[PDB]
Amino acid sequence: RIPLWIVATVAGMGVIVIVGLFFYGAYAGLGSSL
Amino acid sequence: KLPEAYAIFDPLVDVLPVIPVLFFALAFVVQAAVGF
Amino acid sequence: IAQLTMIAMIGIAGPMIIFLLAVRRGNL
Amino acid sequence: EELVNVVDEKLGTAYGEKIDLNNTNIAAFIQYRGLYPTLAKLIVKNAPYESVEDVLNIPGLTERQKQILRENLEHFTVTEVETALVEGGDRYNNGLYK
Amino acid sequence: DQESSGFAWWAGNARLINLSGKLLGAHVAHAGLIVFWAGAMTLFELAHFIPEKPMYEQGLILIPHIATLGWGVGPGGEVVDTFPFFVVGVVHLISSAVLGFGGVYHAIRGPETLEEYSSFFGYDWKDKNKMTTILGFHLIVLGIGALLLVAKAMFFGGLYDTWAPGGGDVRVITNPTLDPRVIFGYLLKSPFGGEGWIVSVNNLEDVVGGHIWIGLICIAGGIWHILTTPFGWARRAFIWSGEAYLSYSLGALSMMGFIATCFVWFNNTVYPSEFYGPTGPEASQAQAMTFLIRDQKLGANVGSAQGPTGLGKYLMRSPTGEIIFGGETMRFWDFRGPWLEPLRGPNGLDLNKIKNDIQPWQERRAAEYMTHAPLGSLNSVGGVATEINSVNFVSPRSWLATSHFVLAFFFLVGHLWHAGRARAAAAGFEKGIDRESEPVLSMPSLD
Amino acid sequence: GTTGERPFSDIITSVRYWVIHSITIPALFIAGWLFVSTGLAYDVFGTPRPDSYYAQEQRSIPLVTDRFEAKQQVETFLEQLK
Amino acid sequence: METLKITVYIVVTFFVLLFVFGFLSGDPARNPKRK
Amino acid sequence: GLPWYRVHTVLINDPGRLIAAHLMHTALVAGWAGSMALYELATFDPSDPVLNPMWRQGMFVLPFMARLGVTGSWSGWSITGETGIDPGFWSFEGVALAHIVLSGLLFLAACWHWVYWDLELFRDPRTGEPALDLPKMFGIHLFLAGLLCFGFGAFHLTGLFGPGMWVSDPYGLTGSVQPVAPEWGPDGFNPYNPGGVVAHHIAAGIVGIIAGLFHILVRPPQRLYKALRMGNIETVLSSSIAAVFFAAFVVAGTMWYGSATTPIELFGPTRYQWDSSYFQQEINRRVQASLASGATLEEAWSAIPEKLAFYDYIGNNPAKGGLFRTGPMNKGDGIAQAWKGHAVFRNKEGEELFVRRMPAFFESFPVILTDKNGVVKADIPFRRAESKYSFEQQGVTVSFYGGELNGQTFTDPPTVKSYARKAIFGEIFEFDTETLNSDGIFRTSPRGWFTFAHAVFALLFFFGHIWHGARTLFRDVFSGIDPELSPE
Amino acid sequence: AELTPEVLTVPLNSEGKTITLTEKQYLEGKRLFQYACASCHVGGITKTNPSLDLRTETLALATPPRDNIEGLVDYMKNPTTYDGEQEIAEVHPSLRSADIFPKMRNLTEKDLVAIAGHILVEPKILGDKWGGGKVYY
Ligand SMILES: CCCCCCCCCCCCCCCCCC(=O)OC[C@H](CO[C@@H]1O[C@H](CO[C@H]2O[C@H](CO)[C@H](O)[C@H](O)[C@H]2O)[C@H](O)[C@H](O)[C@H]1O)OC(=O)CCCCCCCCCCCCCCCCC
Ligand SMILES: CCCCCCCCCCCCCCCCCC(=O)OC[C@H](CO[C@@H]1O[C@H](CO[C@H]2O[C@H](CO)[C@H](O)[C@H](O)[C@H]2O)[C@H](O)[C@H](O)[C@H]1O)OC(=O)CCCCCCCCCCCCCCCCC
Ligand code: CLA
Ligand code: CLA
Ligand code: CLA
Ligand code: CLA
Ligand code: CLA
Ligand SMILES: CCCCCCCCCCCCCCCC(=O)O[C@H](COC(=O)CCCCCCCCCCCC)CO[C@@H]1O[C@@H](CO)[C@H](O)[C@H](O)[C@@H]1O
Ligand SMILES: CC1=C(/C=C/C(C)=C\C=C/C(C)=C/C=C/C=C(C)/C=C/C=C(C)/C=C/C2=C(C)CCCC2(C)C)C(C)(C)CCC1
Ligand SMILES: CC1=C(\C=C/C(C)=C\C=C/C(C)=C/C=C/C=C(C)/C=C/C=C(C)/C=C/C2=C(C)CCCC2(C)C)C(C)(C)CCC1
Ligand SMILES: CC1=C(\C=C/C(C)=C\C=C/C(C)=C/C=C/C=C(C)/C=C/C=C(C)/C=C/C2=C(C)CCCC2(C)C)C(C)(C)CCC1
């Protein structure tokens, strides 16, 4: 029922948001050098 | 650090550059809605 | 600080045009 | 008829225990209260000394400087100038960095 | 143009090569992201720029260019006007809307076919003249500012000149170059180490001086093609197809981008280092300079110091020019910058000079450049391959020169795949090889 | 080939998928998070937390010396160790 | 040995010139159906 | 047009010509035995079982003649170093002159099973064609195996009928071939426990005989014979290559790590024997007993036995070699002529120091003398301009106890150094290199090679296993895929 | 917990007094040290002139003593060789000489005290890794 593209983009942003978090997380994350 | 009177917007000034990219992105969203 | 919330809106600005286009019609 | 390494041997003289005025790298001069910077440029420059004291009689040494040397005299020694150790102006930059 | 009667989705933009482009607007569409990008990053740049911190030390790719043009700098590479920078990005950015506001239109609500609305010059590729005339416009177009710059160079403020008398400093190009031997001569100049045909450029007098010559030379072309039709050996030679046109055209970038990547890594003139980092060679020369001093200042004779290898530490000898710094540093005895030229001589580096006329303002600039060197990891931890995390800094030159190569490279890949597919229409086997009429299944077997 | 097992587009695009899941997915996302937050993950896998890799004074590494009385080692290290 | 310097050029030029004059004579011909 | 790999397939059916085949790879191997056997025999030097035991001389095949029991040559010498007692015909020469005649006849039985290739026995009655029953054939051969395995187990090793098997223990070694008593207790599995061997063969023999009968009688389920496509000889090959390769990997293990099936003296000392200072610690005990027992530190080490110091010489630690380091451990460090003496390095202060040994992985290595407690009191500088611990500036020195050097001490900074760098190898020694003209680099012990042998070999065979197994089972599709398509 | 109070406490004067410290100041120390420039000076060595390091002992033998949370301050304010003979102000970042090294302008007694405490503190934790380079890395 629910349009297919609409599930892809919201599913995608999550990967792009979660992944994004991971990059921030490498700067303040324990693994930073500070 | 932009002129003092703009202090309010460092937040956006911050993002503005991401947009360019954003376009190749959208280009896909549409192509997907339009079943290729 | 705030930077993040304001980025959010712009990012979902584009798929929203796709949505507002789904409902109405055209494009095709 | 038994040839032998020169630095290795001179490491066996008093050169290895203290600071050699006539050979030792100018770098071993910091290891004592206020010697490195200038005194060294004069210690190192200035001919090679036959006696450990001829240091004190160096042209233009300052009434204070004179003192210092005296004070530090404890740690200075000498051995024949070592061709292999002094050539190449190595004494100024031995090739040894941190 | 829908699916069938078109290409697949990944070859999307191909169905726009059909009939007359529905949108110029695509090209304009992005002709905006490109100008908008300056609008964002420029804003973003200054948005992070501090006036004290060395411009290259603060990931400034965009901002350094404004400075190099004479804006917001003056004495030394110091920035006095945080304003001018801000100005340019603010403008562009906003400027982009109009560019996008229109491209965005031309692509959906205007003539889905300007082939018909034609009239105004119009559309169709094979049309050998509409194309000669078009590029023709864009030819007056470029040369247009070639002068725009000459103006900024000669009539609005000047540029930044590291060589410039006193020291790096905003200066106005008074007397550009006449003599065609010089301005042109560079092309005929060596390509290899010692003299790069484009790159080698001591001053602005030859730059702005040369640009002039290019504005007119380039305008004379737009004026030219606009009026005439290409000759018959031309037609005979080159395939004409919308694609084929991109095909050529695209491989002018490839080359050109390398010409950039190869340029931003090598010049201290048009890329001052007070805004970009010290140029690669400059670095390993700067080191030299710093230590030649450290010992000479420590009491070493320097000039007559026999080095470990057999050459000499501080000073060595090159085959053509007699005297230069020695280390592994030699490779860069061609490096020239204002911070080391005073201590220069007829025969080369002068022992008498280097020994006593070597001033302080140099030991400190020399040490900045020894440190700040074009060496870093994607991680962005500036330094040797194996340095501890702490001081991080990646030269603008690193990013600049690197990128453009990968892109310019890739483009060369393009010049191929677009020539490969286009030289194909030329006979029609581009779609494939006809199952019943293939040249090979009917040919004299090699043996 | 002839294939016949319950289709995908169906459910990724299904109304029920999103309703059973919306609530349960982050239940795992959250569950994992808590696993880290409580700080149990550490005790779960011995994995030391930044606060306790080296004792306070010592500079040496708590290395397992003998494969057979290893259990002891770990302890006696984790022992003196803060 | 300045001799060599020129002996080569010609050998290089000749070829570069034979290269261009070959592609110059346009190759839209010299394929399937001389089109 | 039949391609070569396919050419040996010729037979597959026609077991006749095949017998003559195996009848050969068999008369060809046997030969090689007697062959190199003679060879190694044409070179083994007995002169000293002390510093020139076989394994150094690059002996590979003669090492076994010992396991089984052949200790000597018709020339009045042995491998233990005996006198007056010379074996019967069955002495090295024999073992060789032996396999030499063997293969030699098998070559004949060989060229027989060819012309005389078509025999009744190879012809199945009810069937009009050449067929070979395997489901039983196999069990038969089995019966012989165990029959023999036991026939050996209890009738040989136990010393009841024949000589024991090479054995000794971690001192000396004072190895020899004596009779073994199968000990079935649990420690019969301590691979090391020799008894643990005679017990296995006598024991597995039983299990074989029984099985043979069983497989000579019982018949295979039609559910297996249909799966394992028995009947198609092709399957017995993958059904064996499989075990063979595994049989390998085990011989590869027993070899490398220790085992009573591969001694300490008939094969290069185990690489692990040096990992843990096994040889120096089991030494210090004896030189400590002798020491705290009222003896000169001199009488102390002069107490320790030749052969044993030697074991504590990294130069025998199998690892150190090289894949192409072409020969017998001797054209390496040379011919070990004798032990110099233990080298204890004294400080100038008088403190005792130790040469921090060279771990099996490094061909290169910087000598460092650590204080008895891991601290660093001496080294041989590389910078040398900022040296803080040089032998010369720290007055290092060396004394010697035992060996031939004994009671002597060396003081001159050069030799003291030298002696150290050579100490990083374990026990210093005196090698005659001239005779063989050694190179100065290490080589690996038989044990070393043998391992790398049933190494690449076994690691390949499993590929044969996977290949024939796959060509056994899919002998159907082998030809083509079957022109028919679309269903599935 | 590991970055404890006294381990963050260091000598103030050539006379003994200790200033202890905060997690706040320490931080500015890091932020500073790097911004004040580790470009030659990265880790605990000295790229322009490797012969001099920042290890506690080295600063003590300096002249005047430079191990004092004080010492380093004079220096940063006005620099001197290891002679304490001639001011090195023109070739070394110093408030005395701001017009040369910009980064040194925005610096304050607050900012200084910090970058200072950072120097005397880092060794205490990093051990030798402070003075040495490459080798210890
Ligand atoms: C003589 C015949 C040779 C026959 C070779 C034929 C081979 C076919 C060509 C393919 C590749 C080889 C061609 C070489 C081109 C590369 C440029 C080069 O090597 O020459 C080196 C020079 C460097 O110039 C430097 O110039 C310096 C001068 O600057 C110095 O001095 C200046 C003032 O004089 C300033 O003060 C400045 O600050 C200071 O640094 C020094 O003299 C240096 O010694 C000197 O090296 O570059 C330049 O100027 C030239 C720039 C040309 C553009 C090239 C772009 C990048 C190259 C990409 C290659 C494409 C091939 C890719 C194929 C695979 C897939 C793509
Ligand atoms: C090519 C086809 C590939 C097909 C792939 C199929 C995949 C199927 C995989 C199944 C099997 C894999 C898992 C097996 C794990 C066995 C554990 C083991 O290793 O068991 C561990 C022990 C090892 O004991 C060692 O012992 C050493 C020393 O101890 C001995 O010696 C010491 C003195 O140094 C002391 O005296 C001590 O008392 C004495 O026990 C050290 O302590 C070591 O740390 C210790 O590991 O081995 C033993 O007992 C067991 C006996 C070893 C049998 C080995 C069979 C084959 C593999 C080994 C080959 C290695 C050599 C290869 C050479 C080159 C090519 C082959
Ligand atoms: C001409 C191309 C170009 C070049 C040479 C640079 C160079 C730089 N940018 Mg940058 N940037 C660009 C385009 C470019 N940018 C565009 C178009 C945007 C808008 C999205 C930005 C937005 C941006 C931000 C917000 C920041 C930078 C920053 C920087 C600097 C550090 C970035 C870094 O170290 O991460 C390295 C990044 C990578 C290694 C990305 C990995 C590449 C992957 C994804 C594959 C790429 C393959 C492909 C061939 C390359 C694509 C080209 C590129 C345009 C994406 C560096 C000088 C930082 C900075 O210096 O602050 C002042 C910073 O904060 N940029
Ligand atoms: C960048 C290059 C470029 C090129 C080659 C063109 C070319 C064209 N555009 Mg166009 N356009 C562009 C950029 C470009 N545009 C951008 C960046 C935008 C953003 C808005 C637009 C927005 C736009 C619109 C809305 C329309 C066009 C149209 C056209 C076509 C009409 C030609 C004409 O006679 O105009 C000649 C124009 C001038 C000589 C400029 C005169 C300037 C003054 C004297 C009056 C202009 C009005 C005022 C200044 C502001 C403009 C308001 C607007 C409604 C026009 C022509 C093909 C028309 C079309 O439909 O073509 C089929 C049309 O309706 N364009
Ligand atoms: C901007 C993009 C652009 C594009 C795509 C074109 C495209 C074209 N121009 Mg053109 N042109 C432009 C800009 C452009 N032009 C500008 C800015 C000007 C200013 C004048 C001109 C001026 C111009 C003139 C006068 C002519 C053209 C012509 C042409 C056409 C033939 C060009 C040709 O194939 O050269 C191929 C040429 C070669 C491959 C040269 C090979 C021979 C070599 C060996 C030269 C020898 C080198 C010599 C020794 C000196 C140095 C050598 C070396 C060491 C460097 C072609 C359609 C011709 C045309 O027919 O109408 C205009 C023509 O006559 N153009
Ligand atoms: C274990 C004993 C054994 C026996 C009796 C056989 C028997 C056979 N194999 Mg075979 N095979 C084995 C082990 C064995 N294999 C192992 C361990 C592997 C994997 C490592 C293979 C992999 C294999 C393949 C891929 C094929 C066979 C094939 C065959 C059949 C004909 C192939 C042939 O003879 O080529 C003729 C042999 C030669 C012309 C010799 C030249 C090849 C090398 C260069 C010779 C080197 C050996 C010689 C120099 C010295 C030998 C030393 C020794 C220690 C190896 C034949 C029934 C073929 C077959 O029947 O089709 C499925 C076939 O295609 N085998
Ligand atoms: C989308 C990714 C991307 C980004 C973010 C950039 C960003 C940049 N490029 Mg660039 N470039 C790209 C892709 C990109 N490029 C590709 C695919 C090519 C073809 C290989 C090039 C070829 C190129 C060259 C030759 C040069 C640049 C330069 C630059 C810098 C100055 C921009 C500029 O020149 O303004 C407006 C134009 C100028 C300031 C100088 C114009 C140079 C004259 C007119 C020759 C022709 C210009 C060039 C061919 C047009 C490209 C402009 C660019 C905006 C795409 C800027 C950092 C310049 C640079 O090195 O830094 C100053 C430069 O000289 N680029
Ligand atoms: C463009 C895509 C097209 C195809 C090519 C794409 C290539 C993408 C490569 C990215 C891989 C690494 C991601 C960056 C790492 C990072 O940064 O995330 C880390 C964990 O990552 C990860 O957990 C990596 C996740 C990969 C696991 C894959 C397992 C395969 C099973 C999946 C089954 C799915 C049904 C989390 O941060 C790390 O840990 C943090 C502590 O929380 C630290 O603070 C640091 O940030 C440290 O980096
Ligand atoms: C604010 C603002 C603005 C706006 C803008 C815009 C217009 C933006 C945009 C935007 C956008 C528009 C962005 C983007 C995009 C997109 C998107 C959001 C997408 C997506 C996503 C995703 C995640 C996806 C995914 C996927 C997958 C899964 C795979 C492939 C396919 C796809 C892609 C679908 C600007 C800047 C002008 C400035 C002014 C103001
Ligand atoms: C890709 C494409 C597309 C689209 C589009 C394009 C391509 C383009 C473009 C373009 C564009 C899209 C453009 C634009 C724009 C605009 C802009 C970009 C804007 C703006 C403005 C701004 C941004 C601003 C801001 C500000 C101001 C106003 C001032 C002050 C500061 C601030 C920030 C506040 C699609 C997907 C559909 C498809 C086709 C193609
Ligand atoms: C008079 C006579 C005779 C004769 C002869 C004989 C016996 C012999 C022979 C011989 C033989 C018995 C031979 C042979 C052998 C050998 C073999 C058979 C082999 C070889 C080798 C091989 C096969 C190889 C291997 C290899 C190579 C080639 C190299 C590298 C390594 C490898 C392992 C791979 C006899 C005595 C019988 C007796 C009867 C008559």
Q: Are H168 and H155 in contact (CB under 8 A)?
A: no
For ligand 5, whether the C-beta of E220 sits within 6 Å is: yes
Nearest to E329 by CA among E263, E373, E296, E295: E373
CA distance H180 to H419: 44
E91: its two tokens: 């403008």
Q: List beta partners, residue H431.
A: H336
DSSP string, H215-275: HHHS---TTTTTTS-TTSTHHHHHHHHHHHHHHHHHHHHHHHS-BTTB-SSSSPPPHHHHH
List Cα–Cα distances, H148 to E166, H106, H138, H206, H229, in angstroms: 104, 21, 16, 10, 30
Task: Encode burial over H13-25: b for 16+ CB neighbours within 10 A, e otherwise.
Answer: eebbbbbbbebbe
Residue minimizing CA distance to atom 10 of ligand 10: E100
Residue indicated by tokens 């491209």: E103
E385: its two tokens: 């391959």
Query: Cα H454–H459–H464 angle (5° rounding)?
Result: 110
Domain residue spans of chain E: 1-277+374-447, 278-373
Alpha helices per DSSP H over H257-386: 271-275, 278-289, 297-301, 306-311, 330-333
Task: List, in order, residues 6 or more apart from C13 with CB less than 8 Å away.
Answer: none
For ligand 11, whether the C-beta of H26 sits within 6 Å is: no
The residue of I40, I45, I83, I134 whose CB has the most chain D CBs within 10 angstroms, and thus the best one to mutate to test that interface, is: I83
Sorted by where each starts, the structural domains of chain H and their CATH numbers stand as 1-270+444-488 (no CATH), 271-443 (3.10.680.10)
SS3 H383: coil
Q: Which residue of I has its CA nearest to E392?
A: I39
Alpha helices per DSSP H over D1-98: 6-10, 41-44, 65-72, 83-86
Which residue pairs from F57-61 have beta carbons closer than 8 angstroms and sit at least 24 positions apart in sequence? F59/I127
Tell if the CB–CB gap between F51 and I4 is shorter than 8 Å.
no
Tell if the CB–CB gap between C3 and B14 is shorter than 8 Å.
yes
**How far, in Å, from the CA of H238 to the mean position of ligand 9?**
60
Q: Give the phi and the psi of residue H78 in degrees, each rounded to 5.
A: -135, -175
Task: List, in order, residues 6 or more apart from I121 with CB less than 8 Å away.
Answer: I8, I10, I21, I26, I29
Task: Give the rounded distance of the alpha carbon of H319 from its chain centre.
Answer: 14
- How many other C-beta atoms can be found within 10 angstroms of the C-beta atom of residue F15? 9
CA distance H295 to D24: 48
- Whether the CA torsion E431, E432, E436, E438 is positive or negative: it is positive
SS3 H400: strand
List Cα–Cα distances, H488 to E183, F1, H207, H479, H480, in angstroms: 75, 5, 47, 21, 18
Q: Residue A20: its chain C contacts at CB < 8 A? A: none
E207: its two tokens: 């730059």
Tell if the CB–CB gap between C6 and B25 is shorter than 8 Å.
no
Angle between helices A4-24 and B19-33 (to 10 degrees): 150
Q: Are I56 and I118 in contact (CB under 8 A)?
A: no
Nearest to E169 by CA among E39, E237, E76: E76
CATH code for the domain in which residue D44 is found? 1.10.150.320
Tell if the CB–CB gap between A4 and F9 is shorter than 8 Å.
yes
Half-sphere exposure in the Cβ direction for H165 (13 Å, CA):
23
Q: Residue D97: its chain I contacts at CB < 8 A? A: 50-51
Residue numbers preceding breaks in chain A (C to N > 2.5 A) = none
Which residue pairs from H176-179 have beta carbons closer than 8 angstroms and sit at least 24 positions apart in sequence? H176/H71, H176/H80, H177/H66, H177/H67, H177/H68, H177/H69, H177/H71
CA distance E212 to E210: 5
Q: Are I38 and E391 in contact (CB under 8 A)?
A: yes
Sorted by where each starts, the structural domains of chain F and their CATH numbers stand as 1-82 (1.20.5.860)
Which residues of chain F from 38 to 57 reach within 8 Å of chain I, CB to CB?
Answer: 50-51, 54, 56
Q: Are H240 and H141 in contact (CB under 8 A)?
A: no
Residue type, E375: L
User: Which structural domain, as residue segments, surrounds residue D83?
Assistant: 1-87
For ligand 10, whether the C-beta of B28 sits within 6 Å is: no
Half-sphere exposure in the Cβ direction for F76 (13 Å, CA):
9
**How far, in Å, from the CA of H104 to the mean position of ligand 11?**
10
DSSP state of H401: E
**How far, in Å, from the CA of H252 to the mean position of ligand 2?**
9
Residue minimizing CA distance to atom 43 of ligand 1: E193
Which CATH architecture describes the domain E278-373? Orthogonal Bundle (1.10)
The length of chain F in residues reads 82
CA distance I124 to I56: 9
Q: Which residue of E has its CA nearest to B31?
A: E9
Domain residue spans of chain I: 1-137
Way the structure was solved: X-ray
Nearest to H48 by CA among H332, H335, H433, H406: H335
CA distance H390 to E377: 39
CA distance E123 to E138: 16
Task: Give the rounded distance of the alpha carbon of I117 from its chain centre.
Answer: 7
- How many other C-beta atoms can be found within 10 angstroms of the C-beta atom of residue C12? 13
Tell if the CB–CB gap between H390 and D94 is shorter than 8 Å.
no
Pairing of strands D19-20, D76-77: parallel
Atom of ligand 8 nearest to the CA of A32: 44
Q: Are E102 and E90 in contact (CB under 8 A)?
A: no
Q: Which residue in E9, E12, E49 is closest to B1 by CB distance?
A: E49
Tell if the CB–CB gap between B25 and C14 is shorter than 8 Å.
yes
Q: Does D78 reside within a domain?
A: yes
Tell if the CB–CB gap between E300 and D89 is shorter than 8 Å.
yes
Pairing of strands E159-161, E169-171: antiparallel
Task: List, in order, residues 6 or more apart from H231 with CB less than 8 Å away.
Answer: H131, H134, H225
Question: Is chain E in touch with chain B: ≥3 Cβ pairs within 8 A?
Answer: yes
CA distance I125 to I3: 8
For every residue of E209-229, which 3-state class applies, written as one string? HHHHHHHHHHHHHHHHHHHCC
Sorted by where each starts, the structural domains of chain A and their CATH numbers stand as 1-34 (6.10.250.2070)
CA distance I55 to I120: 8
Q: Which residue in A1, A4, A30 is closest to F15 by CB distance?
A: A1
Task: List, in order, residues 6 or more apart from H225 with CB less than 8 Å away.
Answer: H135, H231
Q: Is D9 on the interface with H (CB under 8 A)?
A: yes
Q: What number of H helices and E strands is found in chain A?
A: 1, 0
Residue type, H384: R
F42 annotated ligand binder? no
CATH 1.10.10.10 given to domain I1-137: no
Candidate from E138, E216, E224, E229 with most ligand 5 atoms within 8 A of CB, to mutate? E224
Tell if the CB–CB gap between E427 and G24 is shorter than 8 Å.
no
Atom of ligand 6 nearest to the CA of H463: 19
**How far, in Å, from the CA of F46 to the mean position of ligand 8?**
23
CA distance E269 to E201: 7
Tell if the CB–CB gap between B17 and E44 is shorter than 8 Å.
yes
The domain total for chain D is 1
CA distance E79 to E67: 8
SS3 H313: strand
DSSP state of E391: -
Q: Are D44 and D92 in contact (CB under 8 A)?
A: yes
Which residues of chain I from 77 to 106 reach within 8 Å of chain D, CB to CB?
Answer: 81-86
Tell me how far apart the 2 most distant CA atoms of chain I are, in Å.
Answer: 43
CA distance H166 to H183: 17
H449: its two tokens: 């090679």
**How far, in Å, from the CA of E252 to the mean position of ligand 4?**
29
Q: Is D62 on the interface with I (CB under 8 A)?
A: no
Q: Is I132 on the interface with D (CB under 8 A)?
A: yes
Atom of ligand 8 nearest to the CA of A29: 44
SS3 H413: helix
CA distance H262 to H253: 10
In angstroms, the separation between the Cα of residue B14 and the nearest Cα of chain A is 15
Nearest to H339 by CA among H310, H378, H317, H301: H310
